[PDB]
């Protein structure tokens with residue numbers, strides 16, 4: 001089979017932060033197969049446009065061949081383009097999903113650095129508070145943020161599980177242009193959190209068909225509200241009704257099915273998991289390795305995440321900080337160096353709030369110098385719930 005040589009993935013998202021991106025295609029010759037894009041889009045129910053062929057150069061396989069992707073100027077941003085490359089019948093193709101991020105760089109801290117993953121308890125805290133967190137050199141600390149959380153619940157009137165949004169979640173989605181998109185314009189990836197919610201449905205207990213449908217609903221939410229993917233957290237569900245065709249016995253295999261189907265439905269977006277309950281641990285679905293469908297795994301406070309399948313620690317958190325309750329440690333110089341030495345890709349934080357910024361920022365001292373050459377700066381603004389106005393920190397608290 002054919003795959004991208006650097007990631008070993010048959011489907012690879014490329015974010016352009018400069019004018020060029022170089023990789024290999026690994027198996028003969030390779031070619032861009034524009035006709036296949038219709039087949040790919042039909043299979044995934046996607047609508048990616050073909051990346052301009054004149055921007056892609058191959059150095060015949062030597063088997064591998066160098067491929068360079070150049071950034072262009074005619075294209076629409078916040079849009080994913082495709083490079084379908086062709087040498088079972090699937091093993092004849094791989095795909096690059098290309099996004100130009102040159103103008104949405106404020107969270108991009110460089111190649112090979114650790115990245116931040118932050119959950120907001122949106123019942124209480126405006127996610128615009130992401131903007132309170134910058135390094136002294138102006139970069140935004142938190143590459144990825146989660147709206148914690150929409151729920152999975154049974155819709156009795158429709159006879160199926162659904163995404164169920166409480167009034168706070170729904171208000172953010174309804175107001176996404178003013179309360180979520182300002183983050184995306186600056187390069188932050190905004191994920192919808194999904195969480196169990198005290199009925200027969202759960203993220204690790206959907207049947208195969210139930211998981212396919214719920215995955216497709218989650219993808220529809222991410223498309224409609226212009227979001228960047230999902231986090232799944234398998235907590236708070238009750239025992240399933242095994243007589244219900246949408247449900248099955250809770251298991252890591254059922255959870256993996258949901259993750260796999262979600263990536264299939266939104267292959268250019270992030271599929272991420274909290275490692276708790278039955279949400280994580282099975283490394284293959286339908287012969288496809290987990291590196292292709294778990295982009296980020298974050299662990300419970302006080303633990304580090306671990307990779308499965310072909311994943312590495314680059315897809316894993318090395319620290320998880322509970323910013324409301326205090327546990328999980330600090331992102332100190334010594335911890336930052338430890339995590340780099342261990343090859344971890346992420347640090348996770350949960351439930352920061354402006355009233356506790358003294359605590360939160362105390363726990364971010366020293367680490368930024370090690371990770372980025374620039375410490376986290378003291379905050380000067382904050383946001384109130386549901387209010388787009390930047391307020392002065394700490395005076396306006």
Ligand SMILES: CC(=O)N[C@@H]1[C@@H](O)[C@H](O[C@@H]2O[C@H](CO)[C@@H](O[C@@H]3O[C@H](CO[C@H]4O[C@H](CO[C@H]5O[C@H](CO)[C@@H](O)[C@H](O)[C@@H]5O[C@H]5O[C@H](CO)[C@@H](O)[C@H](O)[C@@H]5O)[C@@H](O)[C@H](O[C@H]5O[C@H](CO)[C@@H](O)[C@H](O)[C@@H]5O[C@H]5O[C@H](CO)[C@@H](O)[C@H](O)[C@@H]5O)[C@@H]4O)[C@@H](O)[C@H](O[C@H]4O[C@H](CO)[C@@H](O)[C@H](O)[C@@H]4O[C@H]4O[C@H](CO)[C@@H](O)[C@H](O)[C@@H]4O[C@H]4O[C@H](CO)[C@@H](O)[C@H](O)[C@@H]4O)[C@@H]3O)[C@H](O)[C@H]2NC(C)=O)[C@@H](CO)O[C@H]1NC(=O)C[C@H](N)C(=O)O
Nearest residue numbers: 121123124148149150166167195198233236274322324351
């Ligand atoms: C058990 C245990 O412990 N567990 C644990 C877990 O938890 C974890 O997890 C993880 O972590 C984190 C932490 O860290 C978390 O978070 C958390 O969570 C929690 C829980 O939650 C859940 O639940 C709840 C409750 O529920 C119940 O109730 C209700 C009413 O109330 C109802 O409705 C329901 O239904 C339920 O009931 C039912 O069931 C039950 C049982 O279950 C029974 O009993 C009954 O009968 C019935 O049936 C809820 O609420 C929640 O939900 C919510 O939210 C979400 C988000 O979050 C969403 O999604 C949803 O939707 C919801 O919302 C909505 O609704 C509500 C109501 O409900 C409203 O209100 C709203 O608005 C909306 O609408 C879930 O489900 C919780 O609790 C917590 O919370 C807290 O925090 C936060 C922040 O973070 C805030 O925001 C809040 O508010 C709160 O706060 C509070 O608290 C705190 C402390 O804690 C503080 O800080 C503050 O300040 C406050 O305070 C106050 O209060 C308190 C009391 O509470 C007192 O104390 C004080 O004094 C004051 O007053 C949080 O959220 C999470 O989840 C996770 N994460 C992730 C990432 O995922 C785990 C792991 O870590 O771990 C565990 N543990 C263990 O495991 C241990 C072992 N076992 C040993 O042994 O060790």
